[PDB]
Amino acid sequence: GSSGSSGDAAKEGWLHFRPLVTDKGKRVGGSIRPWKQMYVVLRGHSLYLYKDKREQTTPSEEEQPISVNACLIDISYSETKRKNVFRLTTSDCECLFQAEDRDDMLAWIKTIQESSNLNSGPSSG
């Protein structure tokens, strides 16, 4: 699916990004911030978040990009009042992602899981 779908991002849409931790050499007592709502865009193998949908062409503003090339998605536990939420863990850091409609959620999980996974698809012919 190349040279067709407009844009340069596999998928895009508003989602709640809740990181588990960013630092390692720091002893903190509790998460730094709760569920954050920022436009999340998937371009290639990196996740570019945005506090607003004013402009995508440009990179993030304050939140650094996260690599998903080797991440691990898993339907977040079914305990959080938040429904249709998938948990993603990148070799660099870990975070969460919520959705609106189940159908929509599944879409993301797939799209991403497809990017991270080996791109050894049939590119012959």
Q: Are 98 and 84 in contact (CB under 8 A)?
A: yes
All structural domains of the chain with their residue ranges: 1-125
Q: Which amino acid is at 96?
A: L
Span 1-125: which CATH code? 2.30.29.30
Experimental method: NMR
- Residue 81 vs residues 17, 29, 37, 76: alpha-carbon distances, Å: 15, 23, 16, 11
DSSP line for the chain:
--S-SSSS-SEEEEEEEEEEES-SS---SS-SS--EEEEEEEETTEEEEESSSS-SSS--SSSPPEE-TTEEEE---TTSS--SEEEEEESS-EEEEE-SSHHHHHHHHHHHHHHHS--------
